[PDB]
Design a protein around this ligand. Structure first.
Ligand code: POV
Ligand code: POV
Ligand code: POV
Ligand code: POV
Ligand code: POV
Ligand code: POV
Ligand code: POV
Ligand code: POV
Ligand code: POV
Ligand code: POV
Ligand code: POV
Ligand code: DU0
Ligand code: CLR
Lengths: 1105, 92
């Protein structure tokens, strides 16, 4: 059969052919009509039975000879005499209507289908999400209309209640009653909840217009939506999405839904609403505008074990306005007022024509309903009762059902309704157990229910006591929420490449992941001795700073909205933002290096930049309050984040807006100075003092207080306690600005000598100038090896890889290596010939020198890059070379397109030679630079300098050259000008940021560079090394200064959020919309008062007479 | 306090509320103990009791060590004096 439906669900065709009631209509002979008119008590004319078994009964006379002992005519049973056979129709109807087909579905099951098969039909066969709520509406059929007030509202709440809770709305479906009002409410809120509300019409296969159009095994039957006139039959309401048509009986009989629909209301409740949650799915009932068998149904749902609560919207119709008042004349759960038989049964007789023959039977159903009014919620329209029934529906499940507030809270948690819990569960006088609000916190975190975490923290959950090792372990291991698949991919890459079967994650492994992501020398609290010891042993089993540990959790689980929330709680907000930026950046990288499908490297790179911006914006806030305290924030050790600093974390994440911020640039400038006040001093007194040492004693140095915001070496901070004479020399020569000019003068003197060497004739032995040059480069080279093998990151292959990322270190490496090739050839060359330049090994050596010196003039751009104006232009030059590449490739092609024809036309008698490669490129290149070779253009002219080249075809080359220069100058050179004009500002801007950023690494370098410059640096190498055998900069703060700084951080974070709320609440767009909404509200009350004052006019009539 | 949180982070550094309460009626008297400590005091209404908690949104407290738990009458002698000694100060 290739279908679970075809093999499971059935039809109910009336095989047995009871004649109609007894009597023929007319038409004296009783053989034609006893066959023709006389339908079956099934409910159809005799030939429609089409009994595969008894098809030949009608031809004879019929099934079941007439007389049959009248008793045995009612003996027909839907149970017995009805062959259970396949479905024969299950598919997809449509509804040509309000601009959409508004598709739907039907199964057309029998009736006595088991109850479980529905749940299996609904969830896997139809692929429907199990709901968190079930609204079972009821009422009467074929009523005209409602007040235009109530009509708009009932939907607005019914929709809201169902969309916010993923609810099912069980209707009859038929567009002659309850379903109509449901559907008419759907279209007023359609294309907003058209994919969250799965309404279901459990209607019969009886009363319906075109039962035969619904037929068809696996069909897409195009069902109508026009009210077929001249009839009473009803239509399936278009705006429903699912139908369970019930094949039984016949047309007209519509009673076979209570047995099935009710079971569905019973079987959904035995399902668990969520995995983490143990409560069953709730069921509610909204009766509007009802009838007599509804009042039976209301009491049948209240009396049930457990009770299904009830909503009653007064004024919709009889049963609503009735019950709303009939359970108003009563004690809370007891007896009625002064004898109420007259007025109650009066309306029960007026609404329902009874006359005491059925007027007690309803009143007896009423007095049972009032035994439980706590479950009959009633929506008092007029006096703004519970605001758009969603509260009234949902709170009815939270009104009296002797359910603990823990269960009242979880239910809101599964619904994702905070407003309900805060206003109706966290009510005054409410009382809680000890870890009920803890278990509710564990659920809200695992479920990513961020707004409930807020509600519980406020109401008094404490994360210091809540969070524990095993709980925090669980939060990583849960598969009951929006997990991150990639966390395991990072764990298995740090463990050994493998994983055990289930592998409940450990926190030491989380610690290992963070170290891999945070990189460098980051060592996490989870991989430390004490944690590694205590965890083996698993207040001791708490955490001192739990929101640092959950921020990490939320960021490794890719739970950003929870991360942002948790970030705003606790301390060290700027640091946490920078750690989050680094975690996400490193996660984004390994996602970009994994063959998985959902790359998530722009989602993570965007989350990194979101926290990156937060750190930058907190820095600006701090800088606007106090510059000196903001600079301290960049460099204080954190002690909860591996003793790093906020600046080092930002540099780790390559976060340029933070490092290029003027606060960070102000600090870097102060560290450049050292102890020197370079506001009272001038750069020429520094240079003068490097050459005149005794002038060191007449500079304006800085006090220990002026240095309070500046990180220092341990040796440098001990000489702050006082300024004696020898301390002042220390302060000078250890300042980075001094080391710079002290190395810059030595470098300039190095180039003057090396320029002298290459320009002056070279003898066998190197001159004194050449020896000094070699000493510089040798010791300069050792100095570079020192810098590499003492950098940061432990791993050589990472130290290597970072250092060779800088342009000038690649060039310096080439410069140093090429030099000693040159010195080796120059010095190692044996002179067999007395005239130098007869010895080629010598020449190759000298020519390497003359080319190696280019590297050393270009390194002056690195020194010049220390200036704020010059440095960006140096960075621009390299960026513009990269960007202009393809314009230059096109120019190179134009050059060859001219060069090859020119040479071929003018030199037709050439043998193969490498000079051909020169000649096709040489003159065409120099043409770009203002050389037209004027007396070589027309080689056959009298003024030609190439008269022997005159020959056939040579008249073509001036035309070629004219075209060539048009293309190069008039087009390509000016395109390049236009290129540079138009990208200048964006390249200059990027280059300023890069200049400012690379200023960190430059200034930090000169704190570890020796005092002495590269010729005399060898002493600082030998001595320092030898003194180490005989045996970074930190900010030092007093305990009171740590206090005042931690308070400064907190104050400025508070200012930061206040200024945002007040900037958003004061914008015109926000004031227009609050004005918009408040004018919307008034426009109701203005009219409402308008109606009241028009009904105080009713007073004027009655009062005055 | 409930009025403070509806106007907090606007006047959180200008209003110095002071609770001159006794060292009697209070939930965790022993958690408040500790010479120069940063005692992490709770804010959950400890059920199954009548004892009261220090309202969180206050900034200063003068707890009055006397008597015992339950007796809460030793504030009128001190709090009133503060109301008398501030007035003898010159406003500016
Ligand atoms: C004694 C003498 C012996 C030796 C002498 C020879 C020594 C040779 C010396 C070579 C200099 C070595 C410098 C290399 C620097 C590498 C590090 C670095 O920053 O790289 C970066 C720059 O990209 C490069 O550096 C790529 C190479 C640049 C061109 C250098 C030679 C050009 C001149 C040759 C002319 C020959 C002309 C011939 C015909 C006349 C990496 O790239 P990026 O920055 O990520 O770029 C991204 C681009 N984007 C923005 C579009 C995305
Ligand atoms: C992180 C980056 C920076 C650091 C990178 C550092 C390492 C970079 C790499 C450096 C090495 C570069 C190559 C060295 C020369 C070999 C090539 C050559 O032609 O040699 C010649 C000289 O052969 C000699 O023996 C005389 C030279 C003395 C040694 C000077 C070079 C080594 C010093 C290194 C100082 C640097 C060390 C720095 C501190 C440790 C051999 O030829 P010939 O015999 O003359 O000619 C034969 C023909 N004949 C018949 C004409 C005679
Ligand atoms: C506004 C101002 C311009 C007015 C235009 C009027 C055009 C009138 C056309 C005149 C052509 C005739 C003149 C030359 C007489 C023929 C013989 C002769 O002397 O040949 C000479 C070369 O020249 C040639 O061999 C042919 C030149 C043809 C191209 C001329 C330009 C065509 C128009 C534009 C084309 C561009 C595309 C146009 C469409 C967009 C020989 O000179 P030689 O090199 O000294 O050779 C002798 C030495 N040898 C024996 C060693 C080889
Ligand atoms: C799509 C746009 C088209 C542009 C216009 C059409 C193109 C221009 C049309 C030019 C007219 C054609 C000239 C024919 C002359 C023949 C004479 C001769 O004997 O041979 C000559 C032709 O041979 C050459 O090689 C020279 C060709 C002229 C090249 C002009 C390039 C500049 C382009 C300008 C573009 C700007 C145009 C401005 C606007 C109009 C060479 O003479 P010779 O080798 O010395 O011969 C020996 C003679 N002797 C003994 C006396 C020394
Ligand atoms: C620039 C400011 C910045 C700071 C820089 C710091 C200092 C670092 C820089 C250099 C260190 C000092 C090196 C020079 C030592 C030798 C000098 C000399 O004359 O030698 C030579 C001495 O002998 P002579 O009498 O010339 O002998 C005749 C020639 N003969 C030797 C070939 C036979
Ligand atoms: C590593 C760091 C270095 C730092 C510098 C300090 C240490 C170095 C300082 C000085 C060393 C001088 C050694 C002199 C040796 C005596 C013989 C001699 O050369 O006589 C020459 C006189 O001298 C000159 O002509 C000067 C040549 C050097 C020019 C650069 C000096 C200025 C830069 C540095 C100072 C200012 C700093 C500027 C920056 C603010 C005459 O010429 P010749 O050479 O004999 O002729 C050779 C001809 N032949 C080969 C064909 C036979
Ligand atoms: C005579 C000499 C002849 C040729 C030498 C030409 C010099 C290199 C050419 C440029 C190559 C380049 O872009 O830089 C590389 C040269 O890295 C080195 O270490 C080069 C060392 C000299 C060999 C290094 O690349 P990088 O700068 O680390 O780029 C980062 C790449 N990343 C983005 C993938 C991390
Ligand atoms: C990484 C390390 C790489 C380099 C390793 C070391 C390489 C070492 C290389 C070469 C060593 C050569 C030793 C001698 C070989 C035998 C020949 C001989 O002795 O004499 C012959 C030398 O003739 C020449 O042409 C010599 C050219 C060699 C220099 C090439 C340097 C390349 C370095 C590039 C830069 C690299 C930069 C690297 C960094 C980026 C002839 O001499 P003669 O007797 O006078 O003959 C007179 C003839 N006459 C009659 C015509 C007048
Ligand atoms: C015995 C000898 C006696 C004489 C010794 C002394 C001689 C003189 C020595 C040296 C020459 C330079 C002196 C001028 C310095 C000006 C001061 C200044 O502000 O400097 C700046 C330059 O910072 C640098 O790093 C400049 C690097 C200089 C070397 C580059 C030379 C380029 C040559 C290639 C061209 C070929 C030319 C070749 C010519 C043949 C540093 O300041 P800043 O960082 O920009 O400040 C900005 C931040 N702020 C706004 C907060 C302030
Ligand atoms: C003897 C001859 C005269 C002497 C020469 C004069 C001295 C030499 C002149 C200028 C040198 C300028 C120094 C570099 C400045 C820093 C740039 C830098 O940091 O990285 C740049 C890379 O750089 C490149 O891609 C190329 C850099 C320029 C190489 C030019 C070589 C000269 C010949 C070339 C022509 C040969 C063709 C013609 C042949 C016919 C960055 O560019 P980016 O990728 O967009 O930005 C990323 C930056 N980031 C990674 C930091 C974020
Ligand atoms: C596509 C149109 C069709 C082509 C025809 C029309 C074109 C216009 C005009 C006319 C064409 C040129 C004719 C005049 C020259 C003839 C005389 C002569 O011999 O001249 C020379 C050779 O010349 C040749 O051998 C001719 C080569 C023509 C190549 C094609 C031209 C490009 C057309 C593209 C047009 C695109 C325009 C621009 C785009 C808008 C000189 O030879 P010689 O000195 O006598 O030889 C003696 C040698 N000896 C001493 C060794 C013995
Ligand atoms: C896309 C571009 C298309 C054009 C082009 O680049 C790519 O294609 C290349 C092919 C090259 C030639 C290949 C082989 C030889 C043979 C050799 O024979 C030694 C002779 C003698 C030396 O003195 C012995 O003593 C001499 C050189 C020569 C002719 C090449 C010349 C350059 C040419 C034309 C190049 C040209 C620039
Ligand atoms: C192919 C060989 C044999 C011939 C000579 C090659 C030419 C093109 C070489 C020789 C020396 C080279 C220069 C040496 C030093 C530098 C400084 C560096 O910061 C940029 C490249 C630059 C500017 C080189 C460009 C290319 C260069 C000029």
């Amino acid at each position: 059969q290739k279908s679970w439906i075809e093999s499971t669900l059935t039809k109910r065709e009336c095989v047995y052919i009871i004649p109609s009631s007894k009597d023929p209509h007319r038409c004296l002979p009783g053989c034609q009509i006893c066959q023709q008119l006389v339908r079956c008590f099934c409910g159809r004319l005799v030939k429609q039975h089409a009994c595969f078994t008894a098809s030949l009964a009608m031809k004879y006379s019929d099934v079941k000879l007439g007389e049959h002992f009248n008793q045995a005519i009612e003996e027909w049973s839907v149970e017995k005499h009805t062959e259970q056979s396949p479905t024969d129709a299950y598919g997809v109807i449509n509804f040509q209507g309000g601009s959409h087909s508004y598709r739907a579905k039907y199964v057309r099951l029998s009736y006595d289908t088991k109850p479980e098969i529905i749940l299996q039909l609904l969830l896997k066969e139809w692929q429907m999400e199990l709901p968190k709520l079930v609204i079972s509406v009821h009422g009467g059929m074929q009523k005209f209309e409602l007040h235009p007030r109530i009509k708009q509202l009932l939907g607005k709440g019914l929709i809201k209640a169902a969309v916010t809770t993923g609810a099912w709305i069980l209707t009859g479906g038929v567009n002659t009653g309850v379903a109509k009002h449901v559907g008419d409410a759907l279209k007023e809120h359609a294309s907003r909840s058209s994919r969250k509300i799965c309404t279901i019409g459990i209607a019969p296969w009886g009363v319906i217009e075109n039962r035969n159009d619904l037929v068809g095994r696996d069909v897409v039957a195009p069902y109508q939506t026009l009210l077929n006139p001249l009839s009473k039959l009803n239509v399936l309401n278009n705006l429903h999405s699912h139908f369970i048509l019930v094949d039984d009986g016949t047309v007209g009989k519509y009673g076979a839904e209570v047995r099935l629909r009710r079971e569905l209301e019973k079987t959904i409740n035995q399902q668990r609403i969520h995995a983490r949650i143990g409560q069953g799915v709730p069921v509610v009932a909204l009766i509007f505008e009802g009838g007599p068998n509804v009042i039976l149904t209301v009491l049948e749902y209240l009396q049930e074990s457990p009770p299904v609560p009830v909503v009653v919207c007064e004024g919709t119709g009889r049963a609503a306005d009735l019950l709303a008042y009939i359970h108003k004349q009563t004690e809370e759960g007891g007896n009625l007022p002064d004898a109420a038989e007259p007025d109650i049964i009066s309306t029960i007789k007026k609404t329902f024509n009874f006359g005491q023959s059925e007027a007690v039977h309803l009143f007896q159903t009423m007095m049972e309903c009032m035994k439980k009014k706590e479950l009959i919620t009633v929506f008092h329209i007029g006096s703004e009762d519970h605001q758009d029934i969603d509260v009234a529906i949902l709170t009815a499940l939270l009104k009296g059902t002797n359910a603990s507030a823990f269960d009242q809270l979880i239910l809101t948690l599964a619904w994702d309704r905070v407003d309900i819990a805060k206003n109706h569960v966290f009510v005054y006088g409410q009382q809680w157990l000890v870890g009920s609000l803890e278990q509710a916190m564990l659920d809200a975190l695992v479920m990513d229910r961020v707004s409930f975490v807020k509600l519980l923290i406020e109401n008094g959950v404490s994360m210091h006591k809540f969070l524990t090792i095993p709980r925090l372990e669980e939060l990583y291991n849960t598969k009951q929420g929006p997990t991150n698949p990639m966390l395991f991919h990072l764990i298995r890459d740090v463990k050994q490449g493998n994983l055990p079967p289930g592998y409940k994650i450990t926190l030491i492994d989380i610690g290992l992941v963070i170290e891999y992501l945070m990189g460098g020398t980051y060592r996490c609290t989870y991989t430390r001795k004490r944690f590694r010891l205590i965890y083996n042993s698993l207040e001791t089993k708490r955490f001192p700073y739990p929101l640092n540990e959950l921020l990490i959790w939320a960021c490794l689980m890719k739970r950003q909205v929870m991360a942002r929330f948790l970030w705003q709680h606790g301390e060290e907000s700027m640091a946490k933002a920078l750690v989050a930026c680094k975690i996400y950046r490193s996660m984004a990288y390994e996602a970009k290096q994994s063959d998985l499908v959902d790359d998530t490297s722009e989602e993570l790179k965007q989350y990194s930049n979101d926290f990156g911006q937060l750190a930058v914006e907190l820095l600006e806030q701090s800088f606007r309050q106090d510059e000196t305290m903001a600079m301290k924030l960049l460099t204080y050790e954190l002690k909860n984040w591996s003793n790093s600093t906020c600046l080092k974390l930002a540099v780790s994440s390559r976060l340029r807006p933070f490092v290029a911020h003027t606060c960070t640039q102000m600090l870097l400038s102060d560290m450049w100075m050292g102890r020197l006040n370079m506001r009272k001093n001038s750069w020429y007194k520094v240079i003068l003092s490097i050459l005149v040492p005794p002038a060191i004693l007449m500079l304006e140095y800085k006090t220990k207080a002026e240095m309070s915001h500046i990180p220092q070496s341990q040796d440098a901070h001990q000489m702050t306690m006082e300024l004696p004479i020898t301390r002042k020399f220390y302060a000078f020569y250890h300042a980075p600005i001094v080391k710079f000019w002290f190395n810059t003068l030595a470098y300039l003197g190095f180039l003057m000598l090396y320029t002298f060497v290459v320009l002056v004739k070279m003898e066998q032995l190197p001159s004194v100038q050449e020896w000094i040059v070699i000493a510089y480069i040798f010791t300069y080279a050792i100095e570079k090896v020192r810098e590499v093998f003492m950098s940061e990151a432990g791993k050589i292959s990472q130290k290597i890889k970072v250092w060779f990322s800088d342009y000038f270190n690649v060039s310096d490496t080439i410069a140093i290596i090429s030099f000693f090739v040159g010195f080796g050839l120059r010095f190692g060359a044996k002179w067999n010939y007395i005239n130098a330049y007869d010895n080629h090994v010598f020449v190759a050596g000298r020519l390497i020198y003359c080319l190696n010196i280019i590297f050393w003039y270009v390194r002056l751009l690195d020194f010049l890059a220390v200036n704020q104006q010059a440095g960006p232009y140096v960075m621009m030059i390299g960026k513009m070379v990269a960007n202009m590449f393809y314009i230059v490739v096109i120019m190179a092609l134009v050059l060859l397109s001219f060069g090859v024809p020119r040479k071929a036309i003018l030199y037709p008698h050439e043998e193969p030679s490498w000079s051909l490669a020169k000649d096709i490129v040489f003159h065409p290149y120099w043409m770009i630079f203002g050389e037209v070779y004027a007396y070589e253009i027309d080689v056959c002219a009298n003024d030609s300098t190439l008269p022997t080249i005159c020959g056939p075809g040579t008249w073509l080359t001036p035309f070629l050259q004219a075209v060539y220069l048009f293309v190069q100058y008039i087009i390509m050179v000016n395109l390049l000008i236009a290129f540079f004009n138009n990208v200048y500002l964006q390249v200059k801007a990027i280059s300023n940021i890069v200049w400012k950023y690379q200023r960190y690494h430059f200034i930090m370098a000169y704190h570890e560079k020796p005092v002495l410059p590269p010729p005399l640096i060898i002493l600082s190498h030998i001595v320092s090394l030898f003194c180490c055998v005989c045996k970074g900069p930190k900010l030092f703060l007093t305990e009171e200064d740590q206090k005042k700084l931690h308070d400064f951080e907190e104050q400025c974070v508070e200012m930061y959020f206040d200024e945002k709320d007040d900037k958003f609440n004061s914008g015109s767009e926000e004031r227009i919309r609050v004005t918009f909404e408040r004018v919307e509200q008034m426009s109701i009350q203005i009219k409402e008062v308008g109606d009241r004052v028009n009904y105080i006019k009713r007073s004027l009539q009655s009062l005055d007479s």
